[PDB]
Write an enzyme that holds these catalytic residues in place. Structure first.
Site, PDB file in Angstrom:
ATOM      1  N   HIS A   1      51.503  74.540  74.192  1.00 17.41           N
ATOM      2  CA  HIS A   1      52.939  74.430  73.913  1.00 17.41           C
ATOM      3  C   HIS A   1      53.241  73.689  72.614  1.00 17.41           C
ATOM      4  CE1 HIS A   1      52.799  70.520  76.339  1.00 17.41           C
ATOM      5  NE2 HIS A   1      53.607  70.148  75.363  1.00 17.41           N
TER       6      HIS A   1
ATOM      7  N   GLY B   1      55.121  63.189  73.480  1.00 16.53           N
ATOM      8  CA  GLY B   1      54.053  63.207  72.504  1.00 16.53           C
ATOM      9  C   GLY B   1      52.666  62.920  73.045  1.00 16.53           C
TER      10      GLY B   1
ATOM     11  N   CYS C   1      50.945  64.658  75.139  1.00 12.37           N
ATOM     12  CA  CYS C   1      50.160  65.824  75.526  1.00 12.37           C
ATOM     13  C   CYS C   1      48.980  66.021  74.580  1.00 12.37           C
ATOM     14  CB  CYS C   1      51.036  67.066  75.550  1.00 12.37           C
ATOM     15  SG  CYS C   1      52.126  67.006  76.960  1.00 12.37           S
TER      16      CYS C   1
HETATM   17  C1  4WI Z   1      53.579  66.317  76.234  1.00 16.83           C
HETATM   18  N1  4WI Z   1      53.624  65.756  75.112  1.00 16.83           N
HETATM   19  C2  4WI Z   1      54.711  66.117  77.240  1.00 16.83           C
HETATM   20  C3  4WI Z   1      54.376  64.897  78.126  1.00 16.83           C
HETATM   21  C4  4WI Z   1      55.559  64.592  79.104  1.00 16.83           C
HETATM   22  C5  4WI Z   1      56.679  64.103  78.422  1.00 16.83           C
HETATM   23  C6  4WI Z   1      57.271  62.951  79.345  1.00 16.83           C
HETATM   24  N2  4WI Z   1      56.051  62.494  80.164  1.00 16.83           N
HETATM   25  C7  4WI Z   1      55.065  63.404  80.050  1.00 16.83           C
HETATM   26  O1  4WI Z   1      54.004  63.337  80.580  1.00 16.83           O
HETATM   27  N3  4WI Z   1      54.834  67.299  78.079  1.00 16.83           N
HETATM   28  C8  4WI Z   1      56.154  67.938  78.277  1.00 16.83           C
HETATM   29  O2  4WI Z   1      57.165  67.473  77.821  1.00 16.83           O
HETATM   30  C9  4WI Z   1      56.167  69.164  79.179  1.00 16.83           C
HETATM   31  C10 4WI Z   1      56.157  70.567  78.455  1.00 16.83           C
HETATM   32  C11 4WI Z   1      57.534  71.223  78.676  1.00 16.83           C
HETATM   33  C12 4WI Z   1      58.297  70.325  79.471  1.00 16.83           C
HETATM   34  N4  4WI Z   1      57.290  69.184  79.928  1.00 16.83           N
HETATM   35  C13 4WI Z   1      57.481  68.232  81.005  1.00 16.83           C
HETATM   36  O3  4WI Z   1      56.577  67.469  81.194  1.00 16.83           O
HETATM   37  C14 4WI Z   1      58.769  68.308  81.815  1.00 16.83           C
HETATM   38  N5  4WI Z   1      58.317  68.451  83.169  1.00 16.83           N
HETATM   39  C15 4WI Z   1      58.595  69.681  83.874  1.00 16.83           C
HETATM   40  O4  4WI Z   1      59.208  70.560  83.358  1.00 16.83           O
HETATM   41  C16 4WI Z   1      58.024  69.766  85.294  1.00 16.83           C
HETATM   42  F1  4WI Z   1      58.773  69.061  86.175  1.00 16.83           F
HETATM   43  F2  4WI Z   1      57.939  71.091  85.607  1.00 16.83           F
HETATM   44  F3  4WI Z   1      56.776  69.209  85.281  1.00 16.83           F
HETATM   45  C17 4WI Z   1      59.656  67.051  81.566  1.00 16.83           C
HETATM   46  C18 4WI Z   1      60.934  67.246  82.417  1.00 16.83           C
HETATM   47  C19 4WI Z   1      60.022  66.961  80.069  1.00 16.83           C
HETATM   48  C20 4WI Z   1      58.955  65.741  82.026  1.00 16.83           C
HETATM   49  C21 4WI Z   1      56.237  71.994  78.980  1.00 16.83           C
HETATM   50  C22 4WI Z   1      55.780  73.068  77.991  1.00 16.83           C
HETATM   51  C23 4WI Z   1      55.912  72.088  80.493  1.00 16.83           C
END
Ligand code: 4WI
Ligand code: 4WI
EC number: 3.4.19.12
Lengths: 305, 305
Positions: free
Chosen positions: B41, B143, B145
């Site tokens: 992503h 950030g 990820c």
């Molecule tokens: C990577 N950098 C981030 C790490 C997230 C951010 C907040 N804490 C973390 O671990 N990953 C994301 O933002 C991913 C990404 C889109 C949205 N996302 C989420 O983690 C969201 N969670 C969900 O949508 C759920 F509930 F399905 F897990 C969020 C609401 C922003 C925490 C993609 C491509 C999944």
């Protein structure tokens, strides 16, 4: 989100660990530029440790008696001296992996990471606080001495602890990197005990702010308190007095969450007087006091090195 | 003595972290030999993440659109491909700091260390378990990820986790290094939830052995139990069934302490039925299930890397 006990990345310190052997005693050393720092009781036999005269024992040693190994490479020792409880071995090779570094003496209540090592090789990393009784709650076995504690600031490793000994109840004592013990302890195998410990109030408050940031808010009450009234109540529960310096250091977390420090104090007071009623905060059933305000800010703001 | 939650030394993994930017999306990548691995992503805008077609988005990218930075050095991208939920960027420079390594897929109940990173730079290290519901209890922000989880064996880093997402209640989900998610989750920003979790029984037993080794023995009772009878009781308390494989893996700790596994099970059964009566074990007021039998043996025996 999430909140975990988190250590500094250990790589910069890993590149500095060596093993030091004198006679049949082996422990860890810290190699920075062309000096290796290690606990002076490397020069002791087991029998010497019961009542050592370190100056006398060191008189009888010369440079070549110290076998310093960095991996499978022996580092030739070209000088030595003793500084308090630390031995300094000058070697003929500077460590090319030496990070930017400082030697600091930390204050009770401050935290640091420990890289626990055996025979010059790392075993693991964990986070510790310097307790108010000048012990740390570590995890160390035979051969761990010379393992160090440190903090990192951007690119600079601040070394604050060298491990020397284990006290009754499985807690630990050591020195700064100038060889001066934290607390009233001596490096001799004779009965010693830490004094009664106390709870690090400012750290508990920091961790309650971490809890609010993570959405664990059940313990917030509707009250405020004075600093004086809080400290009277906290004293009974063996909490250290909260100072204005502590209040000032909590300022960034207070401003971020919009909860005044003295309002948090009123919530902590209720937790101390009433208990947690079987509930958890950030998954813990006890109030946690080994996160500093800066630990909370680093973890919740993603500070990197 | 002492027993702490302890991470692997992170240096070998620190030497592999880079930052990957595509458009205005930046996350972390893992640089091994001449390949950088990162979450796919990175190719999404914020809007794309609500319902991404990754194959379509990647069609529209070419090598030069990926800005890979190792410190302040840009690594030229000369190829790319997608493997499940991971993007693989071939670069024209092999990472000279690449450790011996493996990609492994771990089992629920196993533990690993996480090096949490932002913008290619490490923030901290902590220990996690793969929960039975295929989440981890981590600590991650925007950030993070591309941060990875790993175990070390002597000189070999086994990478087992790449971070992708946060689920309700502040727990975390990701993939192995082949891009396959742990659990039924997808990398799309739409409502998803983990199933009910369970307690990792074999790890609780391991930690009770750690407690005995450290002299915290108050919970040992005078009884034994059958494996069948234990599992009936544990089921009620949302503990996973203890298998013969689990009993076999506990063998070394059992032999070291002279406490049969089924005798420990009888003591755990009493703790589950009666509670801890306000007492602690190894300083914890709750039973801990994120130490594996091998975690206990490493820490209490001083295994190094
Ligand atoms: C990577 N950098 C981030 C790490 C997230 C951010 C907040 N804490 C973390 O671990 N990953 C994301 O933002 C991913 C990404 C889109 C949205 N996302 C989420 O983690 C969201 N969670 C969900 O949508 C759920 F509930 F399905 F897990 C969020 C609401 C922003 C925490 C993609 C491509 C999944
Ligand atoms: C350094 N490698 C070891 C680390 C110890 C060993 C077990 N857990 C640890 O942290 N340091 C020592 O063995 C030091 C050392 C002599 C004896 N010693 C102790 O730690 C002893 N403790 C004490 O004598 C007491 F209580 F005063 F702290 C021991 C009983 C072996 C735990 C010297 C030179 C102090």
């Amino acid at each position: 989100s999430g909140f975990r006990k988190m250590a500094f990345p250990s790589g910069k310190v890993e590149g500095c660990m060596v093993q030091v052997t004198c006679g049949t005693t082996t422990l860890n050393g810290l190699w920075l530029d062309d000096v290796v720092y290690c606990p002076r009781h490397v020069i002791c036999t087991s029998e010497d440790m019961l009542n050592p005269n370190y100056e006398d024992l060191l008189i009888r040693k010369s440079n070549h008696n110290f076998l310093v190994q960095a991996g499978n490479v022996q580092l030739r020792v070209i000088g030595h001296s003793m500084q308090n409880c630390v031995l300094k071995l000058k070697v003929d090779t500077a460590n090319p992996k030496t990070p930017k570094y400082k030697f600091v003496r930390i204050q009770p209540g401050q935290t640091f990471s420990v890289l626990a090592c055996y025979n010059g090789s790392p075993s693991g990393v964990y986070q510790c606080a310097m307790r108010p009784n000048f012990t740390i709650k570590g995890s160390f076995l035979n051969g761990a001495c010379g393992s160090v504690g440190f903090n990192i600031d951007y690119d600079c490793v601040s070394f604050c602890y060298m491990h020397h000994m284990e006290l009754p109840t499985g807690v630990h004592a050591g020195t700064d990197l100038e060889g001066n013990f934290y607390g009233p302890f001596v490096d001799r195998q004779t009965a010693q005990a830490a004094g009664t410990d106390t709870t690090i109030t400012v750290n508990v408050l920091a961790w309650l702010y971490a809890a609010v940031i993570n959405g664990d808010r059940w313990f917030l009450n509707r009250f405020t308190t004075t600093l004086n009234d809080f400290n009277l109540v906290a004293m009974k529960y063996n909490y250290e007095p909260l100072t204005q310096d502590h209040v000032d250091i909590l300022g960034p977390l207070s401003a971020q969450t919009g909860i005044a420090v003295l309002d948090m104090c009123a919530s902590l007071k209720e937790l101390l007087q009433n208990g947690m009623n079987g509930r958890t905060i950030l998954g813990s059933a006890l109030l946690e006091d080994e996160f500093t305000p800066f630990d909370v800010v680093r973890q919740c703001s993603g500070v990197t090195f």
